[PDB]
Design a protein around this ligand. Structure first.
Ligand code: HEF
Lengths: 543, 413
């Protein structure tokens, strides 16, 4: 079958010329096959013999099929694909199940063979030149070239898509009640027409594609719902996740552990409970990927525990435009949040979780915001709209925070949902000095070269201290100064320092950071009921 | 109509920007607008053979309850070949911006260059391939556009120009800035006349508009107390020390001397005669903008924005740090209380407008916001035909405190 559709103008990359790689020697058997098959598709008008005026060549190979014991063929278009121009996109982003609309009936058109139905740009055809050699280390060989889109050629997938787009354009217009999704060779058609009505339209569609040289199977064929589509299992009323199986064995290698943790980490999105904490530990100081690791009992319980969670098959539902989109978020710990987008309570569309890395200095509220944002984007791409949020935070808490944050931020229309643990500001620096409180004039310095320093303080109350520190840096020293100040201070403290970093703590006041020292300071800050941190010009007279 | 051959800067290749996800609502609007434009022969559908792409989106201007298509030609423009600005409008009493964008749709664009104007309308949940279009006529927001329409524009304006030399007309892309010193009445009506003049030629050209000089770079004022506490002086000193970067004549030693000795922050300190002077002196230095700062045309303009909280925002337009050409304090627009993005975008626009009026150039923005946040909602409040360059930064606390001290009138108006 070969369609009468206009070819797409395809050209090579700027300044490049067509493939000229030589052909490999073949056994009498594979040669016979290649001749048979090539003559076959030649008669079908798919390929055509060419004269010696074509210097281009690409290596063809033969190999018995996937349970057939019959010889197939394959052309190695690598070189050609390297020279072929870049096309826009082959739609890199697939429809997530949660974004599909519930249809009374779906049908899958397997438009596979179609690749060999769309004609290739004539001018370009010459570049697909390939040769069927001869035993006799002959004179010439059986030369051919593709007239239709070659299987495996860079442009084929893209072209095929647009060609299909054009062919389906009219049908869609004349049948606006039918929705179609295109995915390579699979054409998914769904609607809400009484069984018979549906069947009829499908036939019209088939007839339609047929007219344009597109062969499609008879009897509303091959696959039927549930559709096993890329890890997902689509049912008429809900979608399910393919059973993620865990390899129960008694010997574990580094590689096998990494691969395991991988699957386990993907699973965490749909199974908020999976943990790999211990599992990761089995990778410390690994010398070889094939090294066997004695599974600790802690890991046994974790891995086993994970198996019990994966026992229950999870299923999400489809999108119904006539209902609101609600997204609820929870905090499972510092930096770990869970969310579930749904319309009707418990009838979840999509769920997931985000794991953060504390970084230089961040805070929960900030992270919540960062989550809301990600979720929002995800929603817009899926349901083309932003969900209403149900968040575990006080409106007052939010107000107090954002109205004073140095950076611009925003959280879409949300509603408070009293579900502990609620995220709250662990501490708040005072906006002015505390009356009747000790004042610690802190300072610290360390020799950059020797990494030897001193950190201490002096108070308006007479108290003083200093500590000589080995192997440290000025940053640590200054922070240390502030730390000690907080240690011996009291419930209400005023601390003045010339540290630039402290200034950062003032402007952001994070409740988590990578520097353990800062973490210490944070925990210390959370203990105090009143702390006023003030900064003054370094190397000046303030002391 | 005959067409002028346009080309990309030597060595450059066409833009290949990725389309940002759009909400269903605006996607519909784009389809609506695009199908219409297609029929009118403005744009043509293209296949996948074209690898180039530029982002598109839809916005609704204030006082406009119908969608308009905006494209992010920034990438393309920067790659387009190069081919006047007065002063008067800067000094004018009132200026009116006119959207003369449509006029471009009349002029055709060089066949071979069209490929570079490729854009895509996204599909919800990637259900279907995005619709790929391409311009045939001049595109709005493109720099080459006014650079081609120049001829028709000058002629079209000549009569009004010659019968009204007391008015300044400036064109910056899809906008026409018409300023005059005439009082509100005459000006409004005169603009209406200029409009009708354009209407007669074909294209529809849609308090009142701007006011050039009522925008004065306000100085930085230092607080005054009957008595100062250790803390106060510390703050004051901290600011001054930083300010010396802009005004090297600022000194703070005498104040620092009063700040010697581990005493309570609440402890009050009497200002010594020598300190009184140093302080007073600094006020004098700060009374006016630094000398020597002159706009260098060849260099780009930069604009830093700072969130002051309580709805206030501060900004600085400069070319070299501290050597600011202008400074200002933006107040929240009546209504945009719940979100910063609203205020930020609004601010961005107001500033660019002024950058245009004064220098006739778009300043690069240093936005105090996380990329992710900005990219996701800026379109929702954008109401300008142009899109300025921007980068995101971690706002240093010191600069914020300084400008926070910008002088404010006892009564605005
Ligand atoms: C096309 C389509 C599908 S099928 C599908 C296949 C691949 C990607 C997206 C949808 N399904 C799933 O229903 C299956 C059981 O009836 C659906 O619910 N709505 C649709 O419009």
């Amino acid at each position: 079958p070969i369609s009468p559709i206009e070819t797409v103008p395809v050209k090579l990359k700027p300044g490049m010329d067509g493939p000229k790689v030589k052909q490999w020697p073949l056994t009498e058997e594979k040669i016979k096959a290649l001749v048979e098959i090539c003559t076959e598709m030649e008669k079908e008008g798919k390929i055509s013999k060419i004269g010696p005026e074509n210097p281009y060549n690409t290596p063809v190979f033969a190999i018995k099929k996937k349970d057939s014991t019959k010889w197939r063929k394959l052309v190695d278009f690598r070189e050609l694909n390297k020279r072929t121009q870049d096309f826009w996109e082959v739609q890199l982003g697939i429809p997530h199940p949660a974004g599909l609309k519930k249809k009374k009936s779906v049908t899958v058109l397997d438009v596979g063979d179609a690749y060999f139905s769309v004609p290739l740009d004539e001018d370009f055809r010459k570049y697909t030149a390939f040769t069927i050699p001869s035993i006799n280390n002959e004179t010439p060989g059986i030369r051919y070239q593709y007239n239709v889109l070659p299987q495996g050629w860079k442009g084929s997938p893209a072209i095929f898509q647009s060609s299909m787009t054009k062919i389906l354009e009219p049908f869609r217009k004349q049948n606006p009640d039918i929705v179609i999704y295109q995915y390579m060779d699979d054409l998914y058609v769904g609607s809400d027409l009484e069984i018979g009505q549906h069947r009829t339209k499908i036939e019209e569609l088939r007839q339609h594609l047929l007219r344009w040289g597109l062969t499609t199977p008879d009897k509303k064929h091959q696959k039927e719902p549930p559709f096993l589509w890329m890890g997902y299992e689509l049912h008429p009323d809900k979608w399910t996740v393919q059973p993620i199986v865990l390899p129960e064995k008694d010997s574990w290698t580094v590689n096998d552990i990494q691969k395991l943790v991988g699957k386990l980490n993907w699973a965490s999105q749909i199974y908020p409970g999976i943990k790999v904490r211990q599992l990761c530990k089995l990778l410390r100081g690994t010398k070889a990927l094939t090294e066997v690791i004695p599974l600790t009992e802690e890991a046994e319980l974790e891995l086993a525990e994970n198996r019990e969670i994966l026992k229950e098959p999870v299923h999400g539902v489809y999108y119904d435009p006539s209902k609101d989109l609600i997204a609820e978020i929870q905090k499972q710990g510092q930096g770990q949040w869970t969310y579930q987008i749904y319309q009707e309570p418990f009838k979840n569309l999509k769920t997931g979780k985000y794991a953060r890395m504390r970084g230089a200095h961040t805070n929960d509220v900030k992270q919540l915001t960062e989550a809301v944002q990600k979720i929002t984007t995800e929603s817009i791409v899926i349901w083309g709209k932003t969900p209403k949020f149900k968040l575990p935070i006080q409106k007052e808490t939010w107000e107090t925070w954002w109205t004073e944050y140095w950076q611009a931020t925003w959280i879409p229309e949300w509603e408070f949902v009293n579900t502990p643990p609620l995220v709250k500001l662990w501490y708040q620096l005072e906006k002015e000095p505390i009356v009747g409180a000790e004042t610690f004039y802190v300072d610290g310095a360390a020799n950059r070269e020797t990494k030897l320093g001193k950190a201490g303080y002096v108070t308006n109350r007479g108290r003083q201290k200093v500590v000589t520190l080995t192997d440290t840096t000025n940053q640590k020293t200054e922070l240390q100064a502030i730390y000690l100040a907080l240690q011996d201070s009291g419930l209400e403290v005023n601390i003045v320092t010339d540290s630039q970093y402290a200034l950062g703590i003032i402007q952001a006041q994070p409740d988590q950071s990578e520097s353990e020292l800062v973490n210490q300071i944070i925990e210390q800050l959370i203990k105090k009921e009143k702390v006023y941190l003030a900064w003054v010009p370094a190397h000046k007279g303030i002391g | 109509i005959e067409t002028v051959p346009v080309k990309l800067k030597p060595g450059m290749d066409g833009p290949k920007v990725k389309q940002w996800p759009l909400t269903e609502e605006k996607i519909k609007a784009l389809v609506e607008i695009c199908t219409e434009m297609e029929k009118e022969g403005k744009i043509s559908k293209i296949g996948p053979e074209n690898p180039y792409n530029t982002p598109v989106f839809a916005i609704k201007k204030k006082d406009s309850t119908k969608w308009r298509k905006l494209v992010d030609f920034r990438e393309l423009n920067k790659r387009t070949q190069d081919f006047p600005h007065p002063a008067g409008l800067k000094k004018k009493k009132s200026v009116t911006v006119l959207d003369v964008g449509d006029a471009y749709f009349s002029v055709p664009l060089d066949e071979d260059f069209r490929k570079y104007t490729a854009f895509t309308i996204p599909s919800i949940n990637n259900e279907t391939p995005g619709i790929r279009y391409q311009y045939n006529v001049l595109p709005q927001g493109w720099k080459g556009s006014p650079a081609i329409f120049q001829s028709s524009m000058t002629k079209i304006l000549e009569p009004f120009r010659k019968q009204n030399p007391d008015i300044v007309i400036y064109q910056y892309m899809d906008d026409l800035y018409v300023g005059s010193d005439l009082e509100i009445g005459q000006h409004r009506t005169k603009i209406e006349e200029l409009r009708q003049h354009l209407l007669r030629w074909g294209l529809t050209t849609p308090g009142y508009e701007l006011h050039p000089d009522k925008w004065t770079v306000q100085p930085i004022v230092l607080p005054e107390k009957d008595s100062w506490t250790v803390n106060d002086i510390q703050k004051l000193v901290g600011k001054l020390n930083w300010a010396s970067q802009i005004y090297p004549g600022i000194k703070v030693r005498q104040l620092c001397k009063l700040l010697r000795g581990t005493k309570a922050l609440t402890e009050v300190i009497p200002l010594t005669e020598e300190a009184e002077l140093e302080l007073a002196e600094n006020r004098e230095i700060l009374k006016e903008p630094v000398h020597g700062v002159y706009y260098d045309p060849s260099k780009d303009l930069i604009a830093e924005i700072q969130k002051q909280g309580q709805g206030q925002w501060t900004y600085q337009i400069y070319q070299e740090p501290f050597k600011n050409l202008k400074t200002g304090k933006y107040a929240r627009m009546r209504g945009a209380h719940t979100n910063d993005v609203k205020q930020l975008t609004e601010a961005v626009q107001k500033i660019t407008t002024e950058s245009i009026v004064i220098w006739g150039k778009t300043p690069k923005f240093k936005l105090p916001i996380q990329k992710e946040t900005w990219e996701t909602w800026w379109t929702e409040y954008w109401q300008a035909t142009w899109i300025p360059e921007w980068e995101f930064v971690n706002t240093p606390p010191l600069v914020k405190l300084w400008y926070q001290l910008e002088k404010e009138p006892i009564v605005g108006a």
